[PDB]
Amino acid sequence: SFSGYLKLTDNVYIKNADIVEEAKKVKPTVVVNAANVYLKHGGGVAGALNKATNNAMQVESDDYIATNGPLKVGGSCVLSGHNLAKHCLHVVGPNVNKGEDIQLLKSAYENFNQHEVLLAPLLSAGIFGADPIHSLRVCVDTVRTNVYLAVFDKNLYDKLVSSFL
Ligand SMILES: Nc1nnc2ccccn12
């Protein structure tokens, strides 16, 4: 199971870990991808998870987009987890750098409530441009299911735990 996570709340746990290595170690039921509406896994968590699947996640995502069209910002889709998880929940958080609306972050976290336990990154953090402390606050106030957050950056992980209200 998940090991070395610090408990933040009744259901939110956090660890300084690379979500790719965490997924390969644990092989959880659900790994969350920090997706964009086109499921174009270029950089950040998405590029990293996709590279770990040897691009199989992108091939599957392009077929999903050809059939269904793009996701909504705040939306999600369940696809295969490939070598990382049983499933991958592709969640679209608002990308502040691309000028998207930060109010959609709560809607993005609501997708986690459809899964009992998830391995996930902080939505809209990293290359998505939002304040990670705000993302963790929205996470703990929105997600009711068991969420194991993997924070790649050590200094950010320290800042998050030490500043947690
Ligand atoms: N393995 C890896 N490479 N880049 C990133 C970014 C976020 C989380 C994991 N990452």
Range(s) of the domain holding residue 137: 1-165
User: How many domains does one find in the chain?
Assistant: 1
45 Cβ below 6 A of ligand 1: yes
Strands 87-92 and 76-80: antiparallel
Tokens read off for 155: 């200094």
The answer to whether 71 and 37 are in contact (CB under 8 A) is yes
152 Cβ below 6 A of ligand 1: yes
157 Cβ below 6 A of ligand 1: no
The answer to whether 96 and 102 are in contact (CB under 8 A) is yes
Which stretch of DSSP H or E encloses residue 145? Answer: none
Neighbours of 65 (CB within 10 A): 16
- Among 134, 122, 139, residue whose Cα is nearest residue 45: 122
Tell me how far apart the alpha carbons of residues 107 and 29 are, in angstroms, rounded to a whole number. Answer: 22
Tokens read off for 133: 């402390």
The answer to whether 101 and 94 are in contact (CB under 8 A) is yes
20 Cβ below 6 A of ligand 1: yes
The answer to whether 109 and 116 are in contact (CB under 8 A) is no
Tell me how far apart the alpha carbons of residues 118 and 115 are, in angstroms, rounded to a whole number. Answer: 7
Best of 18, 57, 128, 149 for a ligand 1 pocket test (most atoms within 8 Å of beta carbon): 18
143 Cβ below 6 A of ligand 1: no
44 Cβ below 6 A of ligand 1: yes
Best of 15, 20, 53 for a ligand 1 pocket test (most atoms within 8 Å of beta carbon): 20
